Amino acid sequence: VAWYARYPHILEEATRLPFAYPIGQYYDTGYSVASATEWSKYVDTSLTIPGVMCVN
Amino acid sequence: VAWYARYPHILEEATRLPFAYPIGQYYDTGYSVASATEWSKYVDTSLTIPGVMCVNFTPTPGESYNKNSPINIAAQNVYTYVRHMNSGHANYEQADLMMYLLAMDSLYIFHSYVRKILAISKLYTPVNKYFPRALLVALGVDPEDVFANQAQWEYFVNMVAYRAGAFAAPASMTYYERHAWMSNGLYVDQDVTRAQIYMFKPTMLWKYENLGTTGTKLVPLMMPKAGDNRKLVDFQVLFNNLVSTMLGDEDFGIMSGDVFKAFGADGLVKLLAVDSTTMTLPTYDPLILAQIHSARAVGAPILETSTLTGFPGRQWQITQNPDVNNGAIIFHPSFGYDGQDHEELSFRAMCSNMILNLPGEAHSAEMIIEATRLATMFQVKAVPAGDTSKPVLYLPNGFGTEVVNDYTMISVDKATPHDLTIHTFFNNILVPNAKENYVANLELLNNIIQFDWAPQLYLTYGIAQESFGPFAQLNDWTILTGETLARMHEVCVTSMFDV
Amino acid sequence: YVRKILAISKLYTPVNKYFPRALLVALGVDPEDVFANQAQWEYFVNMVAYRAGAF
């Protein structure tokens, strides 16, 4: 797309995202619909990443 | 005299004298008149030489009360740098990022403190009896405990470095480097073997203490004082208390990840590991000597538990409230507190303009700036809430990254069995009417003169109701004003908080 | 006006403490808001220029 090549400044200001989340810490994704709290446990906002597995 | 050139053998046999007395041990000069014992205490045959003095400093952001402060400017700059290379987490502010960074600084200072404590205990010399028990007493640890658990201390400080490696802080910012260098070194007043050691001990730390939605708040964390037999268990408790509210915080993990993304792993600050063959060695540093000489004490920190009649809610906290002062970082402390709820009349002598004393004749701009980092003059008295104002607190015009609270000096007791003595004092000493107060003050003064670039003293007397100016040897001085000091402190703090 | 508001906020000199907080206050903006949302401000002013340049 030539538009990306023509407006890289606006593309960069629109694609500012924090990557490289440190693992081993619980993260909450939040609610895209703020009124979804009525379905309390029907939505999975949790996000846990395992980091080690031991072979006995 | 040609007679000396003609009879050098008799001159040598007549001038045989023992020099180089090992310091740290009490010496008796004896009596020139053997019948002077009838005047028992009218003759001073004692001779005690102090060997170490500890400067109890305190890390500070530098007098923030609005959004134009250097701390807030650096907060905005670092947040812009982090967030303009961040694609993702947007849930914190510049103020939050800066409280992190300050907590990182506090734990770096703690690591430097414990590393110095470990490295000091391996220092033993025949020419100085203070090494290392006097230094360990001044830092506030138990020398017997360190001797018994050297291995435990080494592994504890290594684990402290490893756990401090979990979070990330910029290495371009010189705040951490300056604090670690200041708190992790031994400094001699002269380049001589039997010199006196200058030390820096953090009086306080910055327990991060997140609770409530009204922002964060760096609550004071006290530190061991001299003459405290603190052990490795106590130091481990202090470290765990410091990092209790630091790990397990998902917002803190987010900040650490974002700063790791912004500043690469090569560009972060790393605490160097220590081992058994690491030797700390006293060094001669004229810059630190000058800035110690031009240092002014501000008094003890004010805590929540400290009672103050007429001055409620004056604790030394770094408040960060989004709805207060437009979310700016606020740190406006009140000085002049000593520890007890009384006047402390000696602090009144600090109300005059300070005198900046410098060695040599020609002074460079950088040297002048470094020579006044610990200087701090009061500007106005804090308004007491209520009709009772038993203590008196002074609001500073502006201070640097460090403020000096007290000075601790260790010296041999004159009486049996001539053990070490604990002497804590500000730049001003008040001596009331007593039989022994005057002679004690004389011993204090003589001990302080032994140190070369000792801080200028301001003695005051309770009976004459009159204080005294700087008790120091003036070499090349000038009169400093509060505005000039504020400008220099602003420059220094802005330079320190730079990326 | 908005371009000058954005460009003033990056001015700093050691001999003049009026830069840039006083200038922004005179222009009638919030310097805290500008420093918090620099990226949004740049995007907004760029879109303003783009949409005004159509005519």
> Which one, of B377, B298, B381, B385, lies nearest residue B339 by Cα?
B298
| Residue among B76, B91, B330 with most chain C CBs within 10 A, to mutate | B76
DSSP assignment letter at B468: -
Residues in C closer than 8 angstroms to A13, CB to CB, are: 39, 42-43
Q: Answer for the pair B201, B55: CB distance below 8 angstroms, yes or no.
A: yes
SS3 B59: strand
- Chain A residues within 8 Å of chain B (Cβ atoms): 15-22, 25-28
Does A16 sit within 8 Å of C46, measured CB to CB? no
> Which one, of B162, B134, B146, B218, lies nearest residue B409 by Cα?
B134
Asked whether the bond before C20 is cis by omega within 30 degrees of 0, the reply is yes
DSSP assignment letter at B247: T
**Residue B210 in tokens:** 């997140």
What's the CA gap between B187 and B199, in Å, rounded? 7
Helix C38-52 to helix B70-84 angle (10° resolution) is 60
**Residue B255 in tokens:** 């900040």
> Which one, of B164, B53, B72, lies nearest residue B406 by Cα?
B53
Report strand pairing: B283-284 vs B187-188. parallel
In the numeric block, the tokens 């134009």 are attached to: B68
Residues in A closer than 8 angstroms to C39, CB to CB, are: 13, 16
**Residue B425 in tokens:** 């004092």
DSSP assignment letter at B128: B
SS3 B422: strand
What amino acid is encoded at B3 in this protein? W
B419: Cα separation from own chain's centroid: 24
Nominal resolution in Å? 3.5
What's the CA gap between C6 and C24, in Å, rounded? 9
Q: Answer for the pair B405, B301: CB distance below 8 angstroms, yes or no.
A: yes
Helix B250-262 to helix B94-120 angle (10° resolution) is 90
> Which one, of B417, B414, B474, B469, lies nearest residue B444 by Cα?
B414
